[PDB]
């Protein structure tokens, strides 16, 4: 839940405004003075890609995912750039491929014979950990990811010969890929293609002729192996050599797109009719991810300069970039209507038709699986440890979380916001301010849970535009990437729902030469402007991508948004080096149920192992964190509390009779559905066991006091509906899905309505 | 190069501090590592925002507003200046053995706080029990008259 | 930590209070728990907004504006700062026995208010019945002339 | 409670009024129902915005800006403050007997206004028929030259 | 033409410097090449922003804020103004010979930074290994009591 | 009709010019062509922005700020007021014959500019060749160490 004023959008939400995107700290940005229309029809979006685990210790070389591990080691490791990383890798590969001594020494080691041939029967086995440990000494570097890529190259070319043990395995995690390409991401997608051309020549080395002469003769000298490896190393090194700067390719192909996008380019510096008729410029011209990447380029750099020969060189640098993009990459070209279909929109309407509140939300799918593992060391002062999954606990919690996913839809939250805003509406037009916008993105709070980050700093980043410098790099570098993604996704939604876009050029203060921005030409049939513009002429021209959402109709999401759980079950024998401790949580819990029976209070404690079917308190086990479930439940809670606070604010100043009865009936209907929801949770696996244990702890405490059994018609029903509400809160307390402060405030809201009394009043008969 | 938006308020405050005293000019010249002359250190301030921030750390009486303005404009000068500006504070000899005497007692505070709820719930429960009896009697009499 | 928009108003007020009197330095040193030196308590203020609010609750003449500005720009310090800043009022011995004699008055007032409407309608009705007769005559004559 | 935006402009105004004269202290203590101490009336102001509005009504020159700012930031206080802060206007002796002589006049005025148009149109028509004839001749001359 | 926002700050500062001393009027007339009269140099300043920047660089004690505001509002003029306002710095005789002695030192610094991480990480690690042992004992004791 | 934001700075400036001297009243009455009374010229200023700008061009010392503010806020009056305020500059008889002697110089400068790049590139190349040789040696030694 992020609340913004659509009128004071500068001081309200600067982190998503286009003035901030092209360098306006002030509010000064023009209406469409000088204009040039454009029609976007494609975009480079990433796929539906989430993070996963991949293992490197085997004899395979997968070039796309070694490229991906370079991405994560360069960016998410705090290193310089994947451009510099691929440059040092080319230097390393040149030094080991143009050196004949190395490919003799580490074949002498892994064959055992320096000068004399080996027979076909006296063939032993050396594990790849040993050849890695001596490759570290022979060919030194400072990056382990080069020694891995050399190790499994030589294990790939020796594995049919039978000189290596297939035993060991070893696994890293790969990270989260952004959807919308930055300038730097375009540079990196050009370098990653050249690295993939490097590695796919190493991946094709067969040693079929070496195996054939081994079988035919019975023996082979180590010099044939040392030649057959050092030939293939140089065949990849020959692919490595003779490349373009990715920076100077992308900066030159984005600058000429700027100069033929803008309406006010000088006649001097202006692309001629040859390069303008380059095969492919007509497709890169109507592309939107390139527009926002151009804005980010001229934002960061400030200006742009050409280096290449602008007549014949640049008319054959462009299809190299087209091939780098059109290759299998993270970023694929798609139509503009495809990439942003999980967004939905609704609004609260006046009698004239004007919006008062507008809600924009992401449509999610509740993930309902969960895993419990235990970490097992290998040796002391060595973080090589690996970790064992435990069925019979993860199965219990999965079977408990699977009914809770069938009651927490995301459409049924905005559908309750709208009923609130239609039930508390007066009869009077809205003129004093624009229609305030709430945007419900569970992904913000989900990354706040996933990185252990305060939500105040993300809300502050979206509000005042800037990020904080106090927090560390592994959270700031994800905050800035997330913030760029939200700006880009807003503009894809706005352009895909208002395809009438017209490019201007900002030159008011003009701290740059030319920095472009769209405007929209949405037709409205309204009279009073939301935001601040002029509504003249049957249509409005607005520069900002959020007001163009504030004039739409209700839109329905066609696709859910999906996050998948990480994979500990399949590879359970490998050792784990990725940080398992940030993505797992400690699981221990204590709760207690109290009830007064004729002026005497009875308390029943309960622990988590008694609920989980365990007898012994185990203390090593850790749950992999349910961030999607927790984020959906947090958005639901914050919306429930906000709706109740607005109805309590409007019931006091209603000053009417029928509208006052409507507000009161709305509150009662609201609280009884909340109570039935929690009580339906408290009949699941953990909840029913908590009931059957807390009842036993109560009953064996009434043992000394002889008391007469009660009516057993209503009294059983009342005590049943109270114990189930307690169990339903306790299970969401014990899984991380609810804090104790918010469970306590939710209990206060349910208690001050006499909601259990109004529910039991419909289990009587008069 | 320092941006003019910072420089407009940053330069005359440093110049007024130099006109107040020249004894800090030798201090900032030995601190940054430039020439002792005011024109040389002012050119270093104009050409490097890190040198400007180190001068606005050496003087902070009048240069606090200019320091905040350079802070709000450039973040990277702050990210480097927190590392370049670090004074290890003096520690007492009795500090860790003194802190060992409170282990028995912070545990007792937390074992109360887990039961009561929050820290604020503990403080408000402590105040409510330490409160006077006549407030309880006033509460009972307002409930007797029919108010809640 | 403390925001600079608040701190640029907080720091000169504390500086003026310390320059005005040194006894309040010892007062805030005993109240917060910092060292008695002005540099230490000023560092505690600049480090922690709760400590800044406790100092602005200690000094009250020139610190009210900075205190309210901190309460504006820090909404999350407010409940804990209220729980820490609590002085119980001194209740009189005669108050609840004095209140016990107004149950006769208040019940009659509430019955008449439930008859009329709201308390605002009761007050407006009482003022209209207490109002002068010439207003009734004026209302009758303005209705007689064709005005409503 | 009182908003800080109101409170920053409201509290030193009441403090300056008390520092101006102490004769208003007993006046506002009798008007609200507080004790005669300025700390008591200041606690009542900071607690209840209706009491804050009554104090900013009792002091009139120095607190009119804080009164209007309270009335801006609190629309809820306005009707109850108008109900409490009421004083009856003194009526003239021959007011209604003087007003009875204007039924001849205002009927004729409204009947003329119906035929003319608006009251603004009747005022402009009265000024046009009161206006000098040289303007009519100048209009006819500019139309004689073909200017319209 | 020159911007009005720039001219409102640039014209009275130059005219104040003219009324201060006319040797600077002769100096800027020789520097730009206009006629020596104040009206002629002011008509050049109001017409050409490059000439306005040259004059606001010729007077620098009192025209610094207007000069930097011109440099804010006109970023296009900055390249040509920097090119025309350029002087060669007097280089030192022992400088490059003293610099060639430091290839042994900078290579070791950069080799250490390649192992550690960034230069910020190297500075922080050098500070930590320069730090006293009592802080390590303090962190061990807080971990011993159960505090991460 | 003049804008109020313009008029609130224009009207007291004209009033200050009238309070300075009354000869300017007769001067602007002869210039604009209105009645010589100050009320008539002050009404003409508020009635017509063209007349307002012509008055602010007649009086020059204090009216330059309000004149630039009028030129900011009124774009439509700019071309018309530039036409109405035109005076021919005095031209010298030897100016064109003195200018004719310089084509030999300017043609060579334009050819060298076409070769090098812009005039900025020509200036930078002329400075780079005019520079000392020790800078070339310093560049060579920083490349010798391996720094680029």
Swiss-Prot record, chain A:
InterPro entries: P1. Its main location: virion. It is found in: Virion. Pfam families: P1. Keywords: Capsid protein, Inner capsid protein, RNA-binding, T=2 icosahedral capsid protein, Transcription, Viral nucleoprotein, Virion. One of its GO terms (molecular function) is RNA binding. GO terms for cellular component: T=2 icosahedral viral capsid; viral inner capsid; viral nucleocapsid. P1 is the major inner capsid (core) protein of the polyhedral procapsid, which is responsible for genomic replication and transcription. Forms a dodecahedral shell from 60 asymmetric dimers. Binds to RNA and may be involved in genomic packaging. Homodimer. Associates with the polymerase complex. This is Major inner protein P1. It comes from Pseudomonas phage phi6 (Bacteriophage phi-6). The gene is P1.
């Amino acid at each position: 839940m992020f609340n913004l004023k659509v009128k004071d959008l500068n001081g309200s939400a600067r982190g998503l405004t286009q003035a901030f995107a092209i360098g306006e700290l002030k509010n000064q940005l023009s209406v469409g003075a000088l204009q040039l229309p454009l029609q976007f029809t494609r975009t480079f979006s990433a796929s539906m890609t989430s993070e996963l685990l991949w293992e490197v210790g085997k004899g395979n070389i997968d070039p796309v995912m070694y490229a991906r591990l370079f991405f994560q080691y360069a960016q998410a490791g705090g290193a310089l750039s994947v451009d510099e990383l691929v440059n040092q890798f080319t230097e390393y590969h040149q030094s080991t491929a143009c050196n004949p001594e190395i490919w003799r020494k580490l074949t002498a080691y892994i064959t055992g014979s320096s000068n004399r041939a080996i027979k076909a029967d006296a063939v032993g086995k050396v594990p790849p950990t040993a050849i890695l440990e001596q490759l570290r000494t022979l060919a030194p570097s400072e990056h382990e990811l080069f020694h891995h890529i050399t190790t499994d190259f030589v294990c790939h070319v020796l594995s049919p010969l039978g000189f290596i043990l297939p035993d060991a395995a070893y696994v890293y995690r790969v990270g989260r890929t952004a959807t919308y390409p930055n300038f730097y991401a375009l540079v990196d997608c050009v370098r990653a293609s050249d690295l993939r051309r490097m590695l796919t020549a190493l991946s094709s080395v067969d040693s079929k002729m070496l195996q054939a002469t081994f079988k035919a003769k019975g023996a082979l000298a180590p010099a044939l192996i040392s030649q057959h490896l050092a030939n293939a190393a140089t065949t990849a090194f020959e692919r490595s050599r003779g490349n373009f700067d990715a920076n100077a390719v992308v900066s030159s192909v984005l600058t000429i797109l700027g100069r033929l996008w803008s309406p006010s380019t000088p006649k001097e510096l202006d692309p001629s009719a040859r390069l303008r008729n380059t095969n492919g410029i007509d497709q890169l011209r109507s592309n939107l991810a390139l527009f926002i990447a151009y804005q980010d380029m001229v934002k960061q750099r400030g200006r742009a300069e050409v280096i290449f020969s602008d007549e014949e060189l640049s008319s054959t640098i462009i299809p190299w970039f087209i091939e780098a993009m059109s290759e299998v990459s993270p970023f694929k070209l798609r139509p503009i209507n495809e990439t942003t279909s999980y967004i939905g929109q609704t609004s609260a309407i006046d009698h004239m038709g004007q919006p008062s509140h507008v809600v924009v939300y992401e449509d999610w799918q509740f993930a309902k699986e969960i895993t419990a593992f235990t970490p097992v060391k290998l040796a002391n002062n060595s973080n090589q440890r690996f970790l064992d999954v435990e069925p019979g606990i993860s199965d219990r919690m999965s079977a408990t979380l699977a009914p809770i996913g069938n009651t927490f839809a995301v459409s049924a939250f905005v559908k309750n916001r709208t009923a609130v805003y239609e039930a508390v509406s007066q009869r009077g037009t809205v003129n004093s301010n624009g229609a305030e916008m709430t945007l419900g993105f569970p992904s913000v709070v989900e990354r706040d849970y996933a990185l252990d980050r305060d939500p105040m700093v993300a809300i502050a980043a979206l509000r005042t535009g800037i990020v904080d410098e106090s927090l560390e790099a592994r959270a700031s570098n994800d905050l800035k990437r997330s913030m760029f993604n939200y700006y880009a996704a807003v503009m894809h939604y706005a352009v895909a729902h208002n395809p009438e876009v017209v490019v201007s050029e900002h030159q008011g203060v003009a701290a740059e030469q030319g920095s472009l921005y769209l405007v929209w030409n949405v037709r409205t049939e309204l009279r009073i402007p939301v935001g601040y513009n002029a509504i003249e002429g049957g249509s409005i021209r607005t520069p900002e991508p959020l007001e163009a959402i504030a004039y739409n109709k209700p839109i329905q999401p066609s696709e859910v948004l999906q996050a998948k759980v990480l994979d500990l079950a399949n590879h359970t024998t490998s050792i784990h080096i990725w940080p398992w401790h940030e993505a797992s949580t400690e699981f221990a819990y204590e709760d207690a149920y109290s009830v007064t029976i004729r002026n005497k209070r009875y308390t029943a404690e309960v622990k988590e192992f008694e609920l989980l079917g365990l007898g012994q308190r185990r203390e090593r086990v850790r749950i992999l964190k349910p961030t999607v479930a927790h984020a959906i439940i947090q958005m639901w809670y914050s919306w429930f509390v906000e709706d109740d606070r607005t109805l309590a604010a409007a019931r006091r100043t209603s000053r009417d009779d029928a509208e006052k009865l409507a507000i009161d009936g709305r509150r009662m209907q609201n609280a009884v559905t909340l109570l039935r929801k929690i009580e339906m949770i408290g009949t699941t696996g953990i909840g029913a066991s908590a009931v059957h244990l807390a009842q036993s702890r109560i009953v064996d405490q009434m043992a000394g006091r002889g008391l007469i059994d009660d009516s057993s018609d209503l009294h059983v029903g009342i005590n049943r509906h109270r114990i189930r509400i307690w169990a339903g809160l306790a299970v969401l307390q014990m899984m991380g899905l609810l804090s104790r402060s918010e469970a306590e405030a939710l209990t206060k809201v349910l208690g001050d309505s006499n909601a259990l009394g109004m529910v039991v009043a419909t289990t009587d008969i008069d | 190069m320092l941006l003019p938006v910072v420089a407009r308020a940053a330069v005359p405050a440093i110049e007024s501090a130099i006109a107040a005293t020249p004894g800090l000019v030798s201090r900032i010249a030995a601190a940054i590592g430039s020439k002792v002359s005011p024109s040389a250190i002012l050119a270093a301030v104009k050409s490097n925002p890190v040198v400007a921030g180190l001068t606005l750390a050496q003087i902070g009486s009048t240069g606090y507003d200019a320091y905040q303005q350079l802070l709000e404009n450039h973040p990277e000068v702050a990210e480097m200046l927190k590392d370049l500006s670090f004074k290890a504070d003096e520690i007492q000899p009795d500090f860790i053995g003194n802190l060992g005497q409170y282990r028995e007692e912070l545990e007792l505070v937390e074992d109360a706080a887990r039961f009561v709820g929050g820290m604020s719930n503990l403080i408000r429960l402590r105040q409510a029990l330490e409160l006077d009896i006549k407030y309880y009697g006033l509460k009972m009499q307002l409930n007797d008259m029919g108010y809640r």
